[PDB]
Symmetry: C3
Subunit: 532 residues, 3 copies
């Protein structure tokens, strides 16, 4: 037909029509719409600013660059998570505050379809919005799908602890994109009055953070955190961050005389100079030699004083904040493969023992934060059963998946429920046929596995069993319904109990049926252990 030409606040944007198998109405797709001014030069380490308005018709027809991040880890994660046929090779640039829109609406008429904003994950160190294709979800459930990008690593989370560089640039970028949604989405047949944000892992945590943030108030109306919340310690730095700032500054070749000096010095560095420092900082990998308490796995969220007025924990204490329908879920085996693999865990033997375990758990301090003293008591409550090493090692991985996502997600769900807001929980237990070959065939419900169902991978990729195609159809219906009514339920779908005092949740997979008190036993155990 004819290229779509929507009219936004900063000017006209031109897209491209794409049809999905067995769908009359073609989906309008705009790739690379800028939602802010490039954070280059002096804008680095500062909040994002409004984008400059353009004069004619901007061609939103090319995949925007992904924020600077280690190019290997980045491309890799893009392949293992992409829900599309071909993995699109991406480019790197500080100029990355862009978002992609997938609208199933017939733009020739008014339309106010629920909007779903996806915040990709990647430990806040890597990732990209272009990885996730919204064609399917948009087509199948009739919702406008928007994929946003935000500053990562040093660029998006470098913090000096003071006003010279507060931090959370990335989250601010996120908040920025949501403001863009409020002021424009209507021109793409979406209802700015019904926005639903949902993210996975670091993306999920972001969502949990926004729910806590004062700035995010009124920018969304329903939230969904998948495999990650604001209590996932590894992503939130509590304590004096000055030391890390100083390390980074030094690694980049900077004086550390004062905060203002460090920030300045760094603003002078070239992107490559900073990408080079990142690599040197050796993030994203498990340090096996050195004090586990000094190892810094990433540059995460902080209590800046603008986005987060206090530790997530304290915050959720007072239900006095913006409470909305919130769906919090986790996967059966979060630490089953994908992560212990990308980080390079000493598990080539495929077996473990009390001694080796306790040592690992200790060296895994940055990820779980368990005191060297309590290590023994924890390693036991989980590995003290069967003497079977291979079982102990499989229990070891559960040990971590519980402290990182399990308990945290449930604790967040509960406080949200007791806040008086509609809460739902789920536990995805399935092994997508899209898994990597290298991932054992026994590992089911690994980290990011639900992604394929959620983004309709079966309808864009190849080889989906008729069983998997159905699983995806259901999950989307469920997700889209939430986006619509703050309740996943609807006819033709199993019943999803609300997460109330009974604590009912939904086990999703080959066999989808409700249950209760998810990880209840674990939340109880860890809570005391940590109480010392």
């Amino acid at each position: 037909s004819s290229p779509p030409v929507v009219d936004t606040v900063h000017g006209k944007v031109l897209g491209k029509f794409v049809s999905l198998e067995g769908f009359a109405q073609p989906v309008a797709i705009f790739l690379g719409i800028p939602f802010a001014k490039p954070p280059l030069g002096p804008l680095r380490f500062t909040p994002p600013q409004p984008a400059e308005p353009w004069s004619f018709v901007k061609n939103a027809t090319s995949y925007p660059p992904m924020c600077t991040q280690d190019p290997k880890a980045g491309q890799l994660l893009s392949e293992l998570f992409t829900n599309r046929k071909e993995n699109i090779p991406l480019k790197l640039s500080e100029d990355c505050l862009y978002l992609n829109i997938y609208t199933p609406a017939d733009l020739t008429k008014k339309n106010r379809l629920p909007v779903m904003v996806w915040i990709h994950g990647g430990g806040l160190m890597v990732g990209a919005a272009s990885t996730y294709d919204g064609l399917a979800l948009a087509a199948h459930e009739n919702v406008v799908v928007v994929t946003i990008q935000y500053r990562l690593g040093i660029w998006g989370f470098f913090s000096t602890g003071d006003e010279h560089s507060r931090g959370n640039w990335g989250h601010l970028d996120q908040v920025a994109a949501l403001r863009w949604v409020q002021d424009n989405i209507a021109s793409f047949g979406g209802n700015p009055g019904s926005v639903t944000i949902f993210g996975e892992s670091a993306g999920g945590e972001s969502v949990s953070v926004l729910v806590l943030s004062p700035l995010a108030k009124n920018l969304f109306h329903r939230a969904i955190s998948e495999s990650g919340v604001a209590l996932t310690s590894v992503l939130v730095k509590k304590g004096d961050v000055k030391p890390l700032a100083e390390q980074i500054a030094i690694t980049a070749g900077c004086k550390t005389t004062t905060s203002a000096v460090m920030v300045h010095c760094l603003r002078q560095k070239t992107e490559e100079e900073l990408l080079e420092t990142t690599l040197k900082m050796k993030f994203l990998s498990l340090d096996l030699q050195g004090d586990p308490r000094e190892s810094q796995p990433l540059l995460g969220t902080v209590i800046d004083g603008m986005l987060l007025l206090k530790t997530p924990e304290e915050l959720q204490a007072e239900r006095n904040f913006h409470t909305v329908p919130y769906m919090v879920g986790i996967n059966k085996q979060e630490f089953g493969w994908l992560i212990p693999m990308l980080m390079s865990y000493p598990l080539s033997e495929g077996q473990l023992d009390q001694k080796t375990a306790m040592s690992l758990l200790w060296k895994s301090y940055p990820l779980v934060c368990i005191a060297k003293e309590l290590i023994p008591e924890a390693t036991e409550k989980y590995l003290g059963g069967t003497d079977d090493t291979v079982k102990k090692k499989d229990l070891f991985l559960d040990l971590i998946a519980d402290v990182m996502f399990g308990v945290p997600s449930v604790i967040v769900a509960r406080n949200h429920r007791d806040a008086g807001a509609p809460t739902y929980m789920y536990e995805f237990q399935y092994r997508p046929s899209f898994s990597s070959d290298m991932k054992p065939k026994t590992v089911i419900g690994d980290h990011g596995d639900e992604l394929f169902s959620v983004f309709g991978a079966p309808f864009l990729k190849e080889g989906a069993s008729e069983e998997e195609i159905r699983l995806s159809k259901m999950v989307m219906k469920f997700w889209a319904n939430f986006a619509r009514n703050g309740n996943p339920n609807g006819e033709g779908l199993p019943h999803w109990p609300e997460y109330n005092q009974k604590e009912g949740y939904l086990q999703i997979g080959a066999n989808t049926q409700a249950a209760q008190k998810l990880k209840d036993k674990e939340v109880a155990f860890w809570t005391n252990l940590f109480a010392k």
Copy 2:
């Protein structure tokens, strides 16, 4: 008793200078800043108001000319200068200055018409210090202002998007005009009677300002000499991104996105960009390669701010600011100066149908004639005498018509049909100030009227009494236009307005009116191009 005028930003000190046979000495101020130096981050951005100074700024030294090829720059300065000694100039990104020549007695109120001169140089070279206003100012009693604007990459670099729209140079130009409105009164000038005039690219600029919304109300009479907004070579229509990327790669930059390019270039040093400017090989006719790829230079673009759409489209609707507009050309635009500089293969002094058609093709950037129509055009002009040397000249007329000839006339007509006072002229004279290397058969070579217009005869030496008179006449004519929007006046031949009869003025040894200038050629090309 140095002149000390008071402007909005502060006091400016100049210098008095007397001209032969004129009681009143002319106050001359060299180097007044009309904008904040576009250095650092200000590069590739619109010009900003200059910082106001505290005491008395000494406007007594020729300001630097914007960065540009020092060789091509200095050479043009000599070949066009209307003064005795050429003044060697300096290069710098800090060049947003203007010079003023006021014949008024600053001890009294005076509101003399103002004439703002926009030098030319293909938007690549040139300076305002080259042209001296002493003469024109004293002789016709008008305040003369010479402005400078960013050239080359510094002034026309465009990414085609909001990250670097382009036309920085033209924006500087508008900047200067705003300055004149808020200050020229302090130099005995009438801010309500400002006339802009340029030569070549400057002529084009003047034509662009007439189409631009931003220029509305900053001038009241316009004059385009050998160049308008339809002189294709100077206006970039089409996706400019490609050229941006090439430039960016040449200077050693990533081309990831638009923002990235602009940012990386902002970081480059002046020398770095001047170096890139040379590498890009602008101003030189590329004889080997696809003529549709050779980029003659960086020019005007349709940015969305200065020009809301192509000049052609704009002049369609007479709904814009219409003012008395004088549009002229010279007998032989492509006679020597232009071809000589770009180094042309006419070292043989003769051509032939085959060779011609090839050149015309390799001159695509200059004329923009499709390889299919080339044969049909090469004929309509060279199809007569078999004399090669005659073809070698008919060839030069061929270019002179597509570049200035027809375009100028087309612009004149649309303005006329807009309901505005329009005048045209055709200068046919060989100044005694021409270069030696210039063949004495060329009469009306590009930029020949400049010597007459700026009274070169009264500043230089050896002007025949016949030339002195031609100059006296042109200025009178120009000045009158600046005064009433009509060149006519007593003591001058009659200059018919450019209405339906299309009367224009042939100027030179024998100055008399005529009609339908290039009429035959306008008609021809118009269709050829209609394919």
Copy 3:
């Protein structure tokens, strides 16, 4: 109990309680409160901007860096003037617009104690606020003592003579601090309505300058210049400064095409690059080989058009400016040791003679500005007495101390007096026990010798005779009383005649008694000599 936490305009500030021998109420000490935004990057060579407000509680508990200067010369001066026990080694940085506060007030209650702002000296090329400890003065006289810093050297006084870099950045920095005191000092139990500014040497000159500046109007209510005023030539550049600018630019490796080109080119230079140029420019040292008229001893105040509308001489002509109680004083032997020492004066023979003298006086042109023709007439009026060479030297040194501080100070005093404003003069003649060993015991009242009494060095240092302890007790009472009522006098202290037509001043030291017409004979002599 623990930590004081004041609340300022830009956010809360946390300090530390320090008790002084024999004083109940502990003094609240805040070190390093920012009063302006770091003048880094593009902000270099531009007026200082308001500081960025912070989010939580800033820890004002570390000595701020001292502005970029000669680390050797800097630390050395720090030692020779510090009133505290241990000299505190400082750090260098362009980020240095900080001030330190010492408030004896009980912050748990409202208090409006007179405020005393100290502007350290150092020839505008070196120095720092951390050198001077306000604990004593604050405690002993119950005044809030504030020590400020301001850009020195190229960073604070680089001028192009035009609007592209007017200059006096350092003096604007000073004014900025005072505005900060107006808008904040109240929160430290200070009376923003009773601020007194006082400085020694270059700091004294600055005080003298703010008294003439329109920008300083209403930021203070009493002034005190110690050994330095606006007529101390060496510190004020009158004439075309462009030449010097260009030299500096050339030395730093810059094009001098235009003023704006030079400023821009310099902004690009790194701190080290500029520190390196500062060193090459061989400042603060006496050039013995070259035209004395070209030697530039330092970068100083200039007639910018903002801070100073015209030369101090012209300005003081019209009493039409802000007149306030002004105490101007000098030391018995300003040029006795310290300076000739630091500047490296050839006097290693400890003796001189008419010929040698006239040559030095000439080569000391930058410091005194005596034309080569008048040199003979001046060298005589002073050395013409005794044929004793060693006396000629002592006399030679007096010759200088009078042209640089003697006369200048008295002239400033008189004009201020004839303006109708309360004026007081003093002559300090004492040899502190804290002097350097290298300082001959003959010398008394060397440059900056009054500092030890003024800042209560005897109460923080060791070895103060009971005679010295008293001298200090007295000086502070005097200074403090002034800060309080614009009149040093009070009961328990000698009488200090106001500086009226009788021209009564106060000789201070072992024997403190009034006198009259200070340097009167010299003011008269040099006035004509200079009139040629």
